[PDB]
């Protein structure tokens, strides 16, 4: 069955390519300065933060807070991308609608962090679709609860990026994360795990063929999901330190994804 | 290398038997009224509890359960010594791996002594029900929910021995000095488990991943709410 595993891999990558406008390949080309196209506007200090908000578009009233809503606007945009990609996954839209919601409900945070790692090196993050680069030192230097809440994301990213996965690897990895059969409140786990079974097989082969010099990559990738679920837990906790940010209709768009 | 990987598997299993006096095989013989062993005393309520230990109750149960963690770190430590390469690692790092990896192993091995209804105590001589514990009041519910999920994998002692070695030797543990020698040991512990599951469960569909995915669920129980106070010092 090594032929349908290749065809499954490809066509998650094909849908991945169209669901997500900014890929890892493109993020690394920009980060490394590593070819033609363009250098991003760098946010290293308060004066660059304020100049970045003119030429740079921002579809999104103190400064460190103005960085939360921006990060929150953006994560909610990402949900609709992850939601579209989920639908390209063979078997997903035949699942019970309730289960589809539960898978996304719990899956989108873990996928957001995975994808946030593609835009991060140890020095900072690509923001505003590669057009910008906020430095890491500019982020530790934010106030009170804003001083961290990005810093552990970087911690995980530097470690995650060391696996040197490409977009074709991540397409399957993300699919694996969505079709996760232990989301609280799933009504029907049989097809969920039979789809995840395929994806794991497709992933195991992809890592084999794509990183043939890298012995236990499938297993080391799976261990990362234990770091992923922990980072998600302490972010949902740091957002009950940030119920202490006004809409309200924006509290009502941007409270979840969902 | 599939002779190296059988040798390693069988080495860890031997050390496992020798380190842990109550195995899962023993626990399952005791739990299912199997004949080789003797039925436990059952603690379902208050004068069962009273009659079993022949100030208050809840925190005195929490004193016992906390001390069972003591011999358990005495035993996990002894096992970790037999893991090829462990004692070669930097002294500080040996400690770092033990401190963060021990509770995840406790909960793995507590799944062996549990069913849907309760837990074995005193090397399998007693049996505390889930509801007498739910009568105190929360601290055991996640253990039981993981235990029920895990025991579905139908893992036995030879599988757990290797899987537990995989836990202890993780290079993601906060503040490891020399990460690379630790990853090197896990890599061959990883392909020894993969050979163990394909050879022991020839019919288990993608069991290897299913088991490492369960490493998530273990990490989250650990986020629960004085040789213990010195393991907890920062996590
Ligand atoms: C996984 O995709 C993303 C999810 C959330 C954010 C981002 C990039 N990004 C953005 C953005 O709006 O593009 C933002 S908001 C922003 C950036 C610069 C100036 C004002 C707002 C952001 C903030 C942090 Cl602390 C980290 C990453 C951030 C990408
Ligand atoms: C996996 O190794 C174990 C780690 C901790 C506990 C146990 C079994 N156990 C014990 C014990 O003393 O053997 C105990 S302590 C105990 C309980 C009643 C009377 C006397 C002691 C315990 C308590 C809970 Cl709430 C759950 C499991 C427990 C086993």
The domain that holds A181 is classified in CATH as: 1.10.565.10
Q: What is the resolution of this structure in A?
A: 2.4
Distance, in Å, from the CA atom of A167 to the CA atom of A95, rounded to the nearest integer, reads: 26
* Conformational region of residue A185, where left means phi above 0, alpha means psi within -120 to 50, and beta covers everything else: left
- Atom in ligand 2 nearest the alpha carbon of residue B143: 26
Ligand 2 site residues, Cβ closer than 6 angstroms: B 52-53, 61, 64-65, 68-69, 72, 106, 109-110, 113, 119, 121-122, 128, 133, 140
What phi, psi does A136 have (nearest 5°)?
-70, -40
Nearest to A161 by CA among A73, A221, A241: A221
Instruction: Compute, in angstroms, the gap from residue A74 CA to the centroid of ligand 1.
Output: 6
Are the CB atoms for B32 and B95 separated by under 8 Å? no
| DSSP state for residue B96 in the 8-state scheme | H
Task: Classify B208 as helix, strand or coil.
Answer: helix
Helices (runs of H) and strands (runs of E) counted in chain A: 10, 3
Distance, in Å, from the CA atom of A106 to the CA atom of A182, rounded to the nearest integer, reads: 10
Angle between helices B207-221 and A217-238 (to 10 degrees): 30
Distance, in Å, from the CA atom of B155 to the CA atom of B152, rounded to the nearest integer, reads: 8
- Mutation for B interface: A176, A195, A216, most B CBs within 10 A: A216
Q: How many domains does chain B have?
A: 1
Residues 6+ apart with CB under 8 A from A206: A9, A168, A169, A172
Q: Does B220 touch chain A (CB under 8 A)?
A: yes
Report the Cα A78 to chain-centroid distance in Å.
8
Apex CA B166: angle with CA B32 and CA B168, to 5°? Answer: 100
Gyration radius of chain B over CA positions: 18
- Atom in ligand 2 nearest the alpha carbon of residue B52: 19
Q: Indicate which technique resolved this structure.
A: X-ray
Among B16, B105, B114, B128, which is best to mutate for testing ligand 2, by the most ligand atoms less than 8 A from CB? B128
| DSSP state for residue B111 in the 8-state scheme | G
Apex CA B164: angle with CA B158 and CA B167, to 5°? Answer: 150
Are the CB atoms for A179 and A102 separated by under 8 Å? no
Apex CA A189: angle with CA A7 and CA B198, to 5°? Answer: 65
Q: Are strands B118-121 and B126-129 parallel, antiparallel or unpaired?
A: antiparallel
Are the CB atoms for A135 and A250 separated by under 8 Å? no
Q: Does B204 touch chain A (CB under 8 A)?
A: no
Full residue range of the structural domain in which residue B122 is found: 1-235
Residue A60, annotated as binding a ligand = no
- Atom in ligand 2 nearest the alpha carbon of residue B110: 1
Nearest to A229 by CA among A165, A183, A163: A183
Mark yes or no for CB contact B220/A201 under 8 Å: no
Mark yes or no for CB contact A226/B205 under 8 Å: no
Ligand at shortest distance from the CA of B119: 2
| DSSP state for residue B204 in the 8-state scheme | -
Instruction: Compute, in angstroms, the gap from residue B193 CA to the centroid of ligand 2.
Output: 29
With residues binned 3-state (H G I as helix, E B as strand, rest as coil), the percentages for chain B, rounded to 5, are 65, 5, 30
Which is it for the CA torsion A210, A213, A216, A222, positive or negative? negative
Checking A186-195 for CB contacts under 8 A at 24+ apart, the result is A186/A99, A186/A102, A186/A103, A187/A96, A187/A98, A187/A99, A188/A95, A188/A96, A188/A99, A191/A91, A191/A94, A191/A95, A192/A95, A192/A99, A192/A103, A194/A91, A195/A89, A195/A90, A195/A91, A195/A92
């Amino acid at each position: 069955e090594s032929a349908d595993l290749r065809a499954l891999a490809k066509h998650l990558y094909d849908s991945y390519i169209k669901s997500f406008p900014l890929t890892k390949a493109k993020a690394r080309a920009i980060l490394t300065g590593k070819t033609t196209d363009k250098s991003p506007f760098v946010i290293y200090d308060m004066n660059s933060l304020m100049m970045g908000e003119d030429k740079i578009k921002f579809k999104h009233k103190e400064v460190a807070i103005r960085i939360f809503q921006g990060c929150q606007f953006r994560s909610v945009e990402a949900v609709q991308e992850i939601t579209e990609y989920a639908k390209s996954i063979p078997g997903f839209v035949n699942l019970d609608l309730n289960d589809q919601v539960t898978l996304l409900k719990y899956g989108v945070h873990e996928i957001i962090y995975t994808m946030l790692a593609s835009l991060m090196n140890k020095d900072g993050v690509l923001i505003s679709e590669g057009q910008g680069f906020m430095t890491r030192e500019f982020l530790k230097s934010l106030r009170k609860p804003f001083g961290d809440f990005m810093e552990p994301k970087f911690e995980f990213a530097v470690k995650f990026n060391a696996l040197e996965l490409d977009d074709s690897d991540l397409a399957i990895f993300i699919a694996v994360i969505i079709l996760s059969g232990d989301r609280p409140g799933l009504l029907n786990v049989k097809p969920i795990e039979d789809i995840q079974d395929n994806l794991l097989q497709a992933l195991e082969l992809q890592l084999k063929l794509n990183h043939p010099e890298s012995s236990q990559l499938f297993a080391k990738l799976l261990q990362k999901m234990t770091d992923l679920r922990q980072i998600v837990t302490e972010h949902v906790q740091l957002l009950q330190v940030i119920k202490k940010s006004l809409h309200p209709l924006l509290q009502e768009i941007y409270k979840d994804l969902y």
